Amino acid sequence: MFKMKVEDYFHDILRERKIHLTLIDPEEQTPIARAAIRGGTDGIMLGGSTTDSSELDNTARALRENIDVPIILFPGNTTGVSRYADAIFFMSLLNSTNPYWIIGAQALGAATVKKMGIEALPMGYLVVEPGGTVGWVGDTKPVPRNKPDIAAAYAMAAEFLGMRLFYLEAGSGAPEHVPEEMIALVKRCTDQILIVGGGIRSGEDAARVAGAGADVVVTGTDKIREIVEGMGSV
Amino acid sequence: MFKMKVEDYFHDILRERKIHLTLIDPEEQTPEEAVEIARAAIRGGTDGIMLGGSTTDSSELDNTARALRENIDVPIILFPGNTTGVSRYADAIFFMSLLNSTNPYWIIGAQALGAATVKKMGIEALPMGYLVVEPGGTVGWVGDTKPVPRNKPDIAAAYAMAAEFLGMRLFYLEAGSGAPEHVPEEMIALVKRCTDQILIVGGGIRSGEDAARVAGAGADVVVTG
Amino acid sequence: FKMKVEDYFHDILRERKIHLTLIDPEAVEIARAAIRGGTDGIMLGGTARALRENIDVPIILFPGNTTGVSRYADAIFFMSLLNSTNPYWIIGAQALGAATVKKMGIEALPMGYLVVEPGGTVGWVGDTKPVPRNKPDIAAAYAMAAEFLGMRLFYLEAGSGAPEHVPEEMIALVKRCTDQILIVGGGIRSGEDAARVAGAGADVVVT
Amino acid sequence: FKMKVEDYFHDILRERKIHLTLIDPEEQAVEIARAAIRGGTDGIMLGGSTTDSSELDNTARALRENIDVPIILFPGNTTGVSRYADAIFFMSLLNSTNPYWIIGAQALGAATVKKMGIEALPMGYLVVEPGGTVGWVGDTKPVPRNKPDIAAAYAMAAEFLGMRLFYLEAGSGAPEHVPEEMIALVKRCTDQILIVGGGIRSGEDAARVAGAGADVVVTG
Amino acid sequence: KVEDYFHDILRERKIHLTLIDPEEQTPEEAVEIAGTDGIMLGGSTTDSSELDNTARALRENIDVPIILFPGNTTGVSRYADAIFFMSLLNSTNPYWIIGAQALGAATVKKMGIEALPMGYLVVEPGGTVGWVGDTKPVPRNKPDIAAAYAMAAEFLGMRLFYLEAGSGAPEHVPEEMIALVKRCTDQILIVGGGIRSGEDAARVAGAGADVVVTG
Amino acid sequence: FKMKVEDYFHDILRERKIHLTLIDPEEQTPEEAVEIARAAIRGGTDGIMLGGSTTDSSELDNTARALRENIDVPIILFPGNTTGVSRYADAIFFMSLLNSTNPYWIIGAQALGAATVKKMGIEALPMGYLVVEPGGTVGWVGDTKPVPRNKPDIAAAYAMAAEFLGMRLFYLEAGSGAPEHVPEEMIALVKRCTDQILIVGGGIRSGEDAARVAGAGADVVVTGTVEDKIREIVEGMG
Numbered sequence A: 001m002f003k004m005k006v007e008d009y010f011h012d013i014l015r016e017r018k019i020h021l022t023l024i025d026p027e028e029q030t031p032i033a034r035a036a037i038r039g040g041t042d043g044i045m046l047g048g049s050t051t052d053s054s055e056l057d058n059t060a061r062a063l064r065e066n067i068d069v070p071i072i073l074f075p076g077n078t079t080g081v082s083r084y085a086d087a088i089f090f091m092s093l094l095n096s097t098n099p100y101w102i103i104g105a106q107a108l109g110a111a112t113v114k115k116m117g118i119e120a121l122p123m124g125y126l127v128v129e130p131g132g133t134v135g136w137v138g139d140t141k142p143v144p145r146n147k148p149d150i151a152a153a154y155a156m157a158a159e160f161l162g163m164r165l166f167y168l169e170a171g172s173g174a175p176e177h178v179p180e181e182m183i184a185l186v187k188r189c190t191d192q193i194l195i196v197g198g199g200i201r202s203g204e205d206a207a208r209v210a211g212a213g214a215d216v217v218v219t220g221t222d223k224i225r226e227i228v229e230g231m232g233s234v
Numbered sequence B: 001m002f003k004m005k006v007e008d009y010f011h012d013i014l015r016e017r018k019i020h021l022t023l024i025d026p027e028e029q030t031p032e033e034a035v036e037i038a039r040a041a042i043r044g045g046t047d048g049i050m051l052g053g054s055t056t057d058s059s060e061l062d063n064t065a066r067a068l069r070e071n072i073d074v075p076i077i078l079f080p081g082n083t084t085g086v087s088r089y090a091d092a093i094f095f096m097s098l099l100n101s102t103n104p105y106w107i108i109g110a111q112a113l114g115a116a117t118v119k120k121m122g123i124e125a126l127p128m129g130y131l132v133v134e135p136g137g138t139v140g141w142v143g144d145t146k147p148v149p150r151n152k153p154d155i156a157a158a159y160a161m162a163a164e165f166l167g168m169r170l171f172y173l174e175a176g177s178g179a180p181e182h183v184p185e186e187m188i189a190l191v192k193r194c195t196d197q198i199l200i201v202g203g204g205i206r207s208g209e210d211a212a213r214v215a216g217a218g219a220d221v222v223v224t225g
Numbered sequence C: 001f002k003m004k005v006e007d008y009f010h011d012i013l014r015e016r017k018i019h020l021t022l023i024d025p026e027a028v029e030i031a032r033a034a035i036r037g038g039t040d041g042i043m044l045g046g047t048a049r050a051l052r053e054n055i056d057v058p059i060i061l062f063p064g065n066t067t068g069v070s071r072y073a074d075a076i077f078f079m080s081l082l083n084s085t086n087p088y089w090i091i092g093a094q095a096l097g098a099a100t101v102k103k104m105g106i107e108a109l110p111m112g113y114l115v116v117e118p119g120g121t122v123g124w125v126g127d128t129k130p131v132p133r134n135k136p137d138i139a140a141a142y143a144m145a146a147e148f149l150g151m152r153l154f155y156l157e158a159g160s161g162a163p164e165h166v167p168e169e170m171i172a173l174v175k176r177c178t179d180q181i182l183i184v185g186g187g188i189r190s191g192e193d194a195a196r197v198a199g200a201g202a203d204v205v206v207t
Numbered sequence D: 001f002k003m004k005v006e007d008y009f010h011d012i013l014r015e016r017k018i019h020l021t022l023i024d025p026e027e028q029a030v031e032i033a034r035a036a037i038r039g040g041t042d043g044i045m046l047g048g049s050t051t052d053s054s055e056l057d058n059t060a061r062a063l064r065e066n067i068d069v070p071i072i073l074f075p076g077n078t079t080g081v082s083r084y085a086d087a088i089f090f091m092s093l094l095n096s097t098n099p100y101w102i103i104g105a106q107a108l109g110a111a112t113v114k115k116m117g118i119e120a121l122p123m124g125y126l127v128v129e130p131g132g133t134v135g136w137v138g139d140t141k142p143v144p145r146n147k148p149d150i151a152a153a154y155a156m157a158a159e160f161l162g163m164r165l166f167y168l169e170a171g172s173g174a175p176e177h178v179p180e181e182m183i184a185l186v187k188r189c190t191d192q193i194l195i196v197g198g199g200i201r202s203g204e205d206a207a208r209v210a211g212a213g214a215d216v217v218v219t220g
Numbered sequence E: 001k002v003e004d005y006f007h008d009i010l011r012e013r014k015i016h017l018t019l020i021d022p023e024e025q026t027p028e029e030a031v032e033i034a035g036t037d038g039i040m041l042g043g044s045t046t047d048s049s050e051l052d053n054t055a056r057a058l059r060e061n062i063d064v065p066i067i068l069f070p071g072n073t074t075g076v077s078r079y080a081d082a083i084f085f086m087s088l089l090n091s092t093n094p095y096w097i098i099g100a101q102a103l104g105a106a107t108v109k110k111m112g113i114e115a116l117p118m119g120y121l122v123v124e125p126g127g128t129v130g131w132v133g134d135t136k137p138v139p140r141n142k143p144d145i146a147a148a149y150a151m152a153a154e155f156l157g158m159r160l161f162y163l164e165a166g167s168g169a170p171e172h173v174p175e176e177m178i179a180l181v182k183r184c185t186d187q188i189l190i191v192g193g194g195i196r197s198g199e200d201a202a203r204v205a206g207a208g209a210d211v212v213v214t215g
Numbered sequence F: 001f002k003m004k005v006e007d008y009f010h011d012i013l014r015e016r017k018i019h020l021t022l023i024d025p026e027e028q029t030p031e032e033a034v035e036i037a038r039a040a041i042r043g044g045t046d047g048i049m050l051g052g053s054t055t056d057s058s059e060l061d062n063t064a065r066a067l068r069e070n071i072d073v074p075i076i077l078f079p080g081n082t083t084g085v086s087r088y089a090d091a092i093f094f095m096s097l098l099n100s101t102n103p104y105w106i107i108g109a110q111a112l113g114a115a116t117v118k119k120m121g122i123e124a125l126p127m128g129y130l131v132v133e134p135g136g137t138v139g140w141v142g143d144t145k146p147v148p149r150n151k152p153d154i155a156a157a158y159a160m161a162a163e164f165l166g167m168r169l170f171y172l173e174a175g176s177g178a179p180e181h182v183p184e185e186m187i188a189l190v191k192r193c194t195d196q197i198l199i200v201g202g203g204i205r206s207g208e209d210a211a212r213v214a215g216a217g218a219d220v221v222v223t224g225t226v227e228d229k230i231r232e233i234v235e236g237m238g
């Protein structure tokens, strides 16, 4: 459970340091969080995939009882809403060619998010030139790694549309994380909480990305203390 | 000129009454004539001048905008139909997403292409969800939309709620220029109940009676062209 | 509920036409009323509804999205929204939801899903071009293509609350052109509405 | 007298693999068919292009004269139908972003197929990286070679939709054939006749693709 | 020859074209159907051999041009005099705009067939081609949209423009819209749709249409 | 007094191949843009293309005005959107992005901008616009499926389709800053199949790039990213 707003919780940490989140997939796990908190994670991301909304419920239920960091929903589809979470990344897949992933899915799930109490964090979601499975399923045109002006352009548009958070996604298991240059440019152009995930395995991966401008660092694939150490090194 | 935040000005008015905006098209008359229309429209007690509604030459836009910014003291707000709808002579821009388009260009593409320009200029950006209702008019057709049916307010509410969650503080229920009937009072009423958005309404609003129903139905802002 | 619903269907179709009751999500009372009214099954579409249990007719999931899969059901109309303009509703959603259907035991009935004018809400959310009521040649064309692709079931959807049900001409023509279990829904309120649809060729009626 | 092509296929699959030879009507030649049967092909696939339906008819007629194995149409558009064939791969290009290649073209060509007697084998058609010309013309998002889970997802969806055959397409002339992992995975997940084509030139390529799970191998 | 055939006639009067469908009657019956100035052959995506025989049957027995009116790549046949090589402009599907055309271009070049560049626009309600073509029919109350497309088509080099109400359409491409489109471009303006009565033809032709098509 | 731009082209094409210099208004001021033009003209460029980006039309006008004052070669608009129209130009490439998956870039944008082009005096040159691998930013923004470099038949197919639809000009686009220009084989095939003024841009930096591209069949050569480099390029094309 988490008493207060997750968004204020984020600003609270950001006064002093950078934020780390651990991404858990229910299909893969059985209702790791505790280990990642012993490493120094500041929150648990839950979802990322299209899977039956009951393995989610059980994993979500199990977590809310036993951990004291926020559970934030990371929906890969409308199957990603669960009342047992503390907040949801209410995201738009901005660089999709399919309106379903941009606003369609979002419209169908809004009543569910509202009927429940869940805090909704507005987030622009942008796939970078590898992109992993989400890039493919999300019908995206991945942003080339050497075209940061494009990423920055979408970051600026997201902000003007009211999205206070921006997520640079290289896709799960990306060989290399989002380019340092791309992150820096986005940080230069907006006042958004800049989140970066994908391909971040080593503390050095975390140092480069954190140093590049990222306010938040997401990881799914202790390794965590190595990572969180890395993000402190800068 | 207007100097201060157009959004605070809106909230200032909303404490006491509902807002009215006049939509002028640069394509349809000369800059002098629009000032005439504008200056005239201020006599009714309009609270601002919306400028756009069409995809047209960005030089007529500039010229009409310049002429207005000099001669009126109410806010000049851009109502862009494309990236051609941006001008530094305006006080704010409705930075809008055409939510029920089947084409990503009208949802995020155009917005992405014009954002650097909007930031390079000083223009204040009001985040706005833009939703076309049946019949949808010309913008419905050009915008590659599936107009929200008039007997499907649940759909309107669904997109309005999502817009809010995405950070869009304003919502525009658009029936399109020359709409035979304004957006149904039912749709407006439901949308107002479900969100904490400034609910803007345009399309087919001609008479005071239309304005009484639409405003009375829940609309915080009414637009007439 | 043992066992195959497709066999349950064929067994009945030997003697009469099938009726299915569509429940939208918890009042068991509605199912039981329609079951003593002589319905042959419960369609469940928009979520547990473990409440059967209390029923002895099949529970068939009628999904509006990937959120429509539940292990307490007996079968799923595993459907493709054929006349959608969005690949998501034709095969995309189906591909993302396929593993769950296999992970559970749920029997999957292959079904073509076709929206007819006016199309209702499913037509709109589904990004469809509803088949016009005076264009049955199109309906038949899609029924045949669906069948050639292996879809043994075909669903003529006018959308919930349709002012008029699917045209009689359209139903008849599709049945003449294929060897499918022909389901028709939308706008069916009166027995007379049910008389037209049933008489025209429909093997299954939904209300 | 003549048996169905699907039944013909199952008869072989009881004992051994299955091989089909892909002929393009546009590119030339009953010589090629006759030659490939002496090698041990089990059938002749006819198509691969969107091209005039007269080059097809003529090639189909000539073939139907000189061989005793099935002629199976492999259509690139509604122009790929000819009454001189024994069966048609009635396919949906599943990972296309364009509804025309998924169901639209199929809807337009259906009556023509019905008017003729042609046996229609229901087949899911999936383009794998790199994808070749069909990948480009077909408006596809090729399934990446290290994302077999995606391939398996579509094989399962195809099956649930009634498609008894599944075609893993790497595109004509692809440098690498569809990966063994993907083939292995897709065969594990469905009870479909699993066809695999593209880039299979050497005997080793066919041994690997066959060994990985492919029930049918295609060579053009 | 066929484009010149057209310009010569329009000097004095308006052109009329008769639309015959190969699917709907036998070639003998088709030769029979043929004061019309030409025979259009198509309207559908249909068996491509029904096309060939009907074209042959036509090509021998008449002295007016047989002009292909393709609904898809199945619509090219070597026995015709000309082809409307057309783009379905207000389609949401790139296949009907340029995709099909690219797939069919080599066939047209391989034959000698004369290709007339034509913008093809479905107007409300639009009929079957509008539906199959994945169109957003131009509303009957928006001639500005039609004209905008007529102008863009012309700038792209399309000398002919076709205002389509759809086969069997209950009502006209509207009087007006034709007028506006004619005012705004220098194209050979073709109109089809539910033109049934002699009264309809006076209206459509008089309104600005250079060409009237009837099936 | 002034000559249409297409006739200007035909005149040069009687004897030699054409060179055009592509300036982006966003990337430098009008003063600096005049410098590029004037330098590019002392090297034998035959014209100045104006566009290349989706950017506010006030930088365009100012760059366009400044040019119209100081040079006597034609100013041709190279629009990236309807914001790419300026009344101060001599002609516009009225183009369709043929291998886009989005109808907006194929005809939609063109339809919304047509009234403006007609209302102004601007000469409209009909042009098929085809993005080749890698495609650059326009390939990405334009929602394209870039023609693979080993698929000249695809390029030729669209070139043939463009011509039949009345498009007298064809542009093979490798994208700004492309590591390598459009393949020779691809250009050759496109020239063999049509009688279009065949334009090629992208990745053309050196005189050899231009010699090879020119030699392959290209009637026209566009270059932007790179001042008297032009003299090498125009030399190469001889």
Ligand SMILES: O=P(O)(O)OC[C@@H](O)CO
Pocket: A023, A048, A169, A170, A171, A172, A173, A174, A196, A197, A198, A199, A200, A201, A218, A219, A220, A221
């Ligand atoms: O590659 P990993 O570390 O699993 O990252 C997951 C990705 O979804 C974060 O955005």
Ligand SMILES: O=P(O)(O)OC[C@@H](O)CO
Pocket: B023, B053, B174, B175, B176, B177, B178, B179, B201, B202, B203, B204, B205, B223, B224, B225
């Ligand atoms: O009905 P009018 O007065 O044209 O106003 C409609 C306007 O909201 C369209 O943008």
Ligand SMILES: O=P(O)(O)OC[C@@H](O)CO
Pocket: C022, C157, C159, C160, C161, C162, C184, C185, C186, C187, C188, C189, C206, C207
């Ligand atoms: O109109 P009813 O009877 O509810 O039927 C609708 C159903 O077929 C689809 O939801």
Ligand SMILES: O=P(O)(O)OC[C@@H](O)CO
Pocket: D022, D048, D169, D170, D171, D172, D173, D174, D196, D197, D198, D199, D200, D218, D219, D220
């Ligand atoms: O011609 P190849 O490369 O063998 O490929 C066969 C077929 O699968 C391609 O359509």
Ligand SMILES: O=P(O)(O)OC[C@@H](O)CO
Pocket: E019, E043, E164, E166, E167, E168, E169, E191, E192, E193, E194, E195, E196, E213, E214, E215
């Ligand atoms: O059959 P009608 O309604 O006369 O029209 C046919 C032709 O106009 C179709 O383009």
Ligand SMILES: O=P(O)(O)OC[C@@H](O)CO
Pocket: F022, F052, F173, F174, F175, F176, F177, F178, F200, F201, F202, F203, F204, F222, F223, F224, F225, F226
């Ligand atoms: O690589 P450059 O020289 O900038 O050329 C690109 C230009 O041709 C865009 O089409």
